[PDB]
Amino acid sequence: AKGTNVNDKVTASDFKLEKTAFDPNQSGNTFMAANFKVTGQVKSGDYFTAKLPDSVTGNGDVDYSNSNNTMPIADIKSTNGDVVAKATYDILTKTYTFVFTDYVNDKENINGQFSLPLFTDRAKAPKSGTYDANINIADEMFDNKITYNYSSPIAGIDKPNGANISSQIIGVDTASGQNTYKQTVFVNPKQRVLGNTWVYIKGYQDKIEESSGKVSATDTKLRIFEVNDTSKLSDSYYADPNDSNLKEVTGEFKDKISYKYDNVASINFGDINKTYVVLVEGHYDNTGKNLKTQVIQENIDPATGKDYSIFGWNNENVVRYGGGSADGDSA
């Protein structure tokens, strides 16, 4: 029974970010860690909170939309095993709520510590740069400066007509059992002149038997957006379908998409000129093995006819973990 907010009775101490700068596009993240003391006593149901700013998240590329935007967090326990608090995280409000167990009833003067992984907010920190990241714990603000150095999505063969494609898995549902994923593909970020262009989306890289991903007309939904100003796309791979910079052309690709070949989707872009965003809504099996994907783009020269080029891009994500402990007095 979630009851009373006792932020006024808890105080945080020794706050440090594990590191202040990283690359979210190369599995970069960090941790917030701190001690806390409960001046006074509490009981089963009392709770305290931590709150994340716009710049960061607490779930990262793991999606919890099909799970009521609530992600469970590892129990906070004593030395001798018993749970001292149950912890939860709200994605939408970026709120950590630690609610005490009955363990704390017959206890007094509770001290503890936690370590929680922090990731980027691809939507709200869409560009590489230095952001403000002031974390709140127990009605107390801790100022930090965070710095995201994204590996640019603008990548490809180094000829004026060379294939160039990038992608990123920015959402993965591991909790629901629905097993879904959201991936953003950047087709032609160099926006160079390309001829007879083809794009392939695989959910397996080199070995099918090694990536859980599944691509077919059933498990995969695709949306395609003509970009107006490539100068305004995110470095974080986040893409807003309702951005005016994007124009959905999905209705123009009816007879240009194929799921015939195993675990791959073909997209006949043809003679293109601009950058295109492809929103991918896919699924992965219950084989328990990892989700590994690959996007491949190939093209000729519009002016020549020869001058072939092909380019591949691998994706995979890593899981981090939270940790916490606490204790009081056995009387």
């Binding site: 970069g28 590329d61 793991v62 898995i169 591991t174």
Partner: peptide
């Protein structure tokens, strides 16, 4: 041995 992400599962 390219782009990769990171996230949390809580459990």
């Amino acid at each position: 041995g390219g782009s990769s992400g990171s996230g949390s599962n809580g459990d």
